[PDB]
Amino acid sequence: ARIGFLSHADMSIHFFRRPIMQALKDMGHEVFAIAPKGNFTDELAKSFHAVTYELDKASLNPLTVINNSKKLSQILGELNLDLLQTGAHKSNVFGTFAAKNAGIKYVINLVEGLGSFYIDDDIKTKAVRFVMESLYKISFAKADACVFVNNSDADYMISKNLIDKSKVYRIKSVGVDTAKFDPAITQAVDLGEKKVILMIARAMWHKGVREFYEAAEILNGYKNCEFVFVGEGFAGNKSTADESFLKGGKVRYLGARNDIPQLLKASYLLALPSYKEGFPRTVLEAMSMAKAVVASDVTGCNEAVKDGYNGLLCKVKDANDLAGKIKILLDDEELCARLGANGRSWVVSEFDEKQIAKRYIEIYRKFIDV
**Shortest reach from residue 197's CB to ligand UD2, in Å:** 16
Size, binding site for ligand UD2 by CB under 6 A: 23
- Spell out, one character per residue from 257 to 276, where the chain touches ligand UD2: x when CB under 6 A holds, - when not: xx-x----------------
Q: Which of 15, 118, 205, 346 binds ligand UD2 (CB under 6 A)?
A: 15
Q: Cite the DSSP H helix spans in 143-237.
A: 151-159, 209-219
**Shortest reach from residue 358's CB to ligand UD2, in Å:** 17
144 binds ligand UD2 (CB under 6 A): no
Q: Which of 10, 211, 277, 303 binds ligand UD2 (CB under 6 A)?
A: 277
Contacts of 248 (CB under 8 A, 6+ apart): none
Which span sits near ligand UD2 by CB under 6 A: 24-32, 41-49, 281-289, 348-356? 281-289
201 binds ligand UD2 (CB under 6 A): yes
Q: Is 257 annotated as a binding residue?
A: yes
The interface with ligand UD2 within residues 108-127 (CB under 6 A) comprises 112-113, 115
153 binds ligand UD2 (CB under 6 A): no
- Which DSSP letter does residue 107 get? E
Q: Which of 109, 178, 267, 282 binds ligand UD2 (CB under 6 A)?
A: 282
CA separation for the pair 22, 363 (Å, rounded): 16
**Shortest reach from residue 328's CB to ligand UD2, in Å:** 24
Half-sphere exposure of 141 (CA within 13 A, CB side): 8
Q: Is 236 annotated as a binding residue?
A: no
Q: Cite the DSSP H helix spans in the chain.
A: 10-12, 18-26, 41-47, 62-78, 89-90, 96-101, 123-142, 151-159, 209-219, 243-246, 260-266, 281-288, 301-304, 319-331, 333-350, 353-364
Contacts of 290 (CB under 8 A, 6+ apart): 183, 340, 341, 343, 344
Measured between its terminal Cα atoms, the distance across the chain in Å is 6
Q: Which of 16, 32, 140, 213 binds ligand UD2 (CB under 6 A)?
A: 16
CA separation for the pair 158, 76 (Å, rounded): 29
Do 325 and 109 contact (CB within 8 A), yes or no? Answer: no
Q: Which of 10, 144, 285, 353 binds ligand UD2 (CB under 6 A)?
A: 285
Nearer Cβ to ligand UD2 (40/140) = 40
Helix (H) or strand (E) holding 51: strand 49-51
156 binds ligand UD2 (CB under 6 A): no
Q: Tally DSSP H helices, then E strands, for the chain.
A: 16, 13
Which span sits near ligand UD2 by CB under 6 A: 190-198, 215-223, 242-250, 255-263? 255-263
226 binds ligand UD2 (CB under 6 A): no
CA separation for the pair 237, 254 (Å, rounded): 20
231 binds ligand UD2 (CB under 6 A): yes
Rounded to 5 degrees, φ, ψ at 245 are -65, -50
- Spell out, one character per residue from 37 to 66, where the chain touches ligand UD2: x when CB under 6 A holds, - when not: ------------------------------
Half-sphere exposure of 191 (CA within 13 A, CB side): 26
Residues annotated within the binding site for UDP-N-acetyl-alpha-D-galactosamine are: 112, 207, 257, 277-279, 281, 285
Which positions lie near ligand UD2, rule CB under 6 A? 15-16, 112-113, 115, 149, 174, 200-201, 230-231, 256-258, 260, 277-282, 285, 300
